[PDB]
């Protein structure tokens, strides 16, 4: 009678269906005055109670954690009806080389899974969160692998059938290899800098899909916005509640565009303690705002959703996995793949003011069609959804830009040459050599960006504008430029990329090189 969960086509099934995750990340033990991490553990069944209902209401049919729970918490979830992702609270700044840190990690595990077996809630353990680049570096890659398939193989073992992989950083750990997990996940945040700037966040998190080979599902664990009063810079902290809502529906259509097929948004309410002070809501603190729910006050255990909260409800109702987001075909037929909770009963798509596509949905969840396009020549199209209520009422509308053709075409490309190219250790001095070659009818923006991102801690490194004013008609437009190479540098992402325009369809050309320093990444680095 147990969940039967399997892995294929890149999606999650839950006996037999296919199965889009739709999560919230959820951390109880959080409220103005408390501190997760160093109170003793409660179980908090009362307010889990609250938050659960909240939650089903928004419209989430699973929850993300960073710790494990008791058995007393799993069987409330278990009640609920939600499907948990649960967290281990593997501490990022450890030696994981350590044999007395591994020892605990494996002790504590088994005893979680003792229990945790007996529910089939969960849907996918997280082994660790955000491991930062030079204390892998610090502790050895082999100790990292090492212990990553200790904890994998123990779960294999404990509670068999569910996936396991981690809450890696896609801004700092995209050259890590994550082929040893069941399912690709990052963090993945677009404030658009570094990686985010050069390739966009679609194609950036596309790319890092790519080079893991789409050979399994892919999950985002982390997205979204801090409204601080003041504090951290641009995009990180200091957003109003209309760029946190905004924010957040851009994010969630860019990483489906990137094939995801699971989606942890961040998160369900604030979190004071982030910022050092628990029973103080710091004005300059971004990492204390980051919720979906305020609280009003200290003593205020319950808060108050903000906007986003109810845009993001509304958009969960019907989604859209295919046809993606500025995406580009070369055939009259374009895949449909939808995912639709019980409340929508048909779904349109027009062209033009034109019906292209109408259908009555029996059955809610996962559906599959196709659509039949007609371009003249190379047309950009603004694919005009509809989702309706049983009623006959709208409830959401959502445009997907695609450019196609009935024959193939030619494209601008842009493509980058990187010194040193292979080893960090040649020389102290970097250059990219950046070349698009032009194309007719693709307009270049004059926006060119550049990237030698060296992953110390979450500093982005050097970044470029640059201007090719000068160089518009030309068939080929080149550029070169230099940035010092840390002696601490141990990884480098260099990137390049430019804004192009067909019609009313904006995309952006890009290339992506990640360079080492010596050995050091031969276990944990993508082979």
């Given at each position: 009678s147990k969940t039967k969960i399997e892995l294929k086509d890149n999606w999650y099934h839950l006996d037999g269906e296919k199965y889009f995750i739709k999560a919230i990340g959820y951390e109880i033990g959080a409220r103005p005055g408390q501190a997760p991490y160093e109170d003793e553990r409660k179980d908090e069944l009362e307010l889990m109670k609250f938050d659960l209902e909240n939650i089903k209401e928004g419209g989430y049919n699973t929850i993300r954690t960073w710790s494990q729970y008791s058995e007393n918490q799993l069987k409330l979830v278990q009640e609920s009806g939600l499907k948990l992702i649960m967290g281990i609270d593997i501490k990022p700044e450890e030696d994981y080389g350590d044999p007395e840190f591994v020892k605990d990690s494996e002790i504590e595990l088994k005893r979680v899974l003792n229990y945790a077996k007996?529910?089939?809630?969960?849907?996918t353990y997280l082994v660790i969160n955000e491991p930062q680049t030079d204390h892998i570096h610090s502790v050895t890659g082999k100790a990292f692998v090492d212990l990553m398939n200790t904890l994998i193989n123990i779960i294999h073992k404990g509670h068999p059938g569910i996936p396991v992989t981690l809450s890696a950083n896609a801004m700092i750990?995209?050259?890590?290899?994550?082929?040893?997990?069941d399912v690709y996940a990052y963090n993945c945040y677009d404030h658009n800098e570094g990686q985010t700037a050069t390739m966009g966040f679609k194609d950036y998190i596309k790319g890092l899909n790519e080079l893991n080979g789409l050979d399994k599902p892919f999950i985002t664990t982390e997205f979204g916005y801090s409204v601080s009063p003041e504090g951290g810079n641009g995009q990180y902290g200091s957003n109003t509640l209309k760029q946190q809502s905004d924010g957040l529906i851009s994010n969630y259509r860019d990483l489906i565009d990137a094939g995801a097929v699971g989606m942890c948004p961040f998160y369900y309410a604030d979190g004071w303690w982030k910022g050092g002070e628990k029973s103080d809501h710091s004005l300059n603190q971004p990492e204390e705002w980051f919720g979906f729910w305020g609280y009003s006050?200290?003593?205020?255990k319950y808060g108050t959703p903000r906007p986003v909260w109810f845009a993001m409800r509304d958009y969960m109702k019907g989604l859209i996995i295919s046809p993606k987001n500025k995406s580009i075909h070369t055939n009259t037929k374009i895949p449909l793949e939808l995912y639709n909770d019980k409340d929508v009963k048909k779904v349109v798509v027009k062209f033009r003011d034109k019906v292209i596509y109408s259908k009555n949905i029996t059955s809610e969840g996962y559906m599959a069609d196709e659509l039949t396009i007609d371009p003249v020549g190379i047309e950009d199209m603004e694919l005009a959804f509809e989702f309706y209520d049983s009623d006959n009422k709208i409830i959401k509308n959502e445009s997907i830009n695609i450019l196609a053709s009935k024959t193939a075409f030619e494209l601008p490309e842009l493509t980058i040459e990187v010194?040193?190219?292979?080893?960090?250790?040649?020389?102290?001095i970097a250059s990219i050599k950046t070349k698009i070659e032009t194309s007719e009818n693709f307009t270049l923006l004059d926006d060119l960006k550049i990237s030698?991102?060296?992953?110390?801690?979450?500093a982005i490194g050097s970044q470029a504008s640059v201007s090719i004013s000068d160089q518009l008609d030309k068939k080929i437009i080149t550029s070169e430029n230099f940035f010092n190479i840390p002696d601490?540098?141990?990884?480098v992402n260099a990137s390049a990329g430019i804004s192009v325009r067909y019609g009313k369809f904006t995309f952006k050309i890009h290339d992506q090189k990640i360079i080492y320093r010596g050995d050091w990444a031969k276990e944990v680095g993508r082979k």
């Open positions: 007996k529910y089939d809630c969960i849907i750990s995209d050259y890590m290899d994550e082929s040893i997990f006050d200290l003593n205020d010194t040193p190219e292979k080893d960090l250790n040649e020389g102290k030698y991102n060296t992953h110390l801690g979450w601490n540098c141990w990884v």
